């Protein structure tokens, strides 16, 4: 996702899915990689401490000045047309300078984007409609002209472009938190279970302190974490040895 040679276009972006694996987020700060790393919904440094169930990464390339328009609540020809994040979006956004690679001579036509649309697109939706954008009352008849423009345009990429006009490889990091068991977590080794003693327990992402004993409750085959009338933690299911 991050180190891939070529990403997809932001007009239609490839979403790579990562689940059931070991995610090492410490290697990022151990070996410097991301040039621009910022997290809107979470902290930049807390990805390693807390781990998530499913990971969703959208790899795409956009112009420099177009990076700030991808974020919850932001507006622009990107957020409002091709790629839109939801207002409640919780995740991270990464960017770095590929200009010495992606840029070819006068331009690169492999990365394209929607420069025009007749409305505001919904978040997490890929619109393949090529319909000519009509700004005025003149009928376009499916061709360019006065107040008639083709919505999908290609990014100008050149080695001589300025910091704002140079390409930056962008990858949006989305995740699912506490909606399922955690299949993506770092090298955290499981230890032996302690009973009849007060201990600090971390079970399938549930952290807390309490005495661990054998419960008389009978969970159904699909049930996992029990809770009392107070909606607190009553009994839990050990994900390793059931």
């Amino acid at each position: 996702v991050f180190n891939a040679t070529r990403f997809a276009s932001v007009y239609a972006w490839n979403r790579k899915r990562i689940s059931n694996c070991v995610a090492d987020y410490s290697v990022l700060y151990n070996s410097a990689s991301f040039s621009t790393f910022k997290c809107y919904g979470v902290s930049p440094t807390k990805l390693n401490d807390l781990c998530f169930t499913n990971v969703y990464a959208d790899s795409f390339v956009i112009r420099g000045d177009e990076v700030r328009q991808i974020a919850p609540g932001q507006t622009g020809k990107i957020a409002d047309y091709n790629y839109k994040l939801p207002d409640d979006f919780t995740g991270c956004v990464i960017a770095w300078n590929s200009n010495n690679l992606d840029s070819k001579v006068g331009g690169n036509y492999n990365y394209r984007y929607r420069l025009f649309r007749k409305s505001n697109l919904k978040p997490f939706e890929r619109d393949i409609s090529t319909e000519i954008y009509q700004a005025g009352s003149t009928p376009c008849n499916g061709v360019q002209g006065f107040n008639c423009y083709f919505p999908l345009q290609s990014y100008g990429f050149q080695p001589t472009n300025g910091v704002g006009y140079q390409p930056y490889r962008v990858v949006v990091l989305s995740f699912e938190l506490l909606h399922a068991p955690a299949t993506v977590c770092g090298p955290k080794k499981s230890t032996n279970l302690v009973k009849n003693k007060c201990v600090n327990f971390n079970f399938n992402g549930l952290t807390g302190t309490g005495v661990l004993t054998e419960s008389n409750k009978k969970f159904l085959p699909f049930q996992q974490f029990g809770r009392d009338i107070a909606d607190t933690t009553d009994a839990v299911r050990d994900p390793q040895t059931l």
């Binding site: 009392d228 009338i229 107070a230 607190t232």
Partner: peptide, 29 residues
């Protein structure tokens, strides 16, 4: 009149103090 949420309350820091005079001492009076 009936004098479990109680167990859950004590987990959040809720405590119930015992009475000084028991129910038997009340019967003595």
């Amino acid at each position: 009149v009936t004098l479990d949420l109680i167990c859950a309350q004590k987990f959040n820091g809720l405590t119930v103090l015992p009475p000084l005079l028991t129910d038997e001492m009340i019967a003595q009076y």
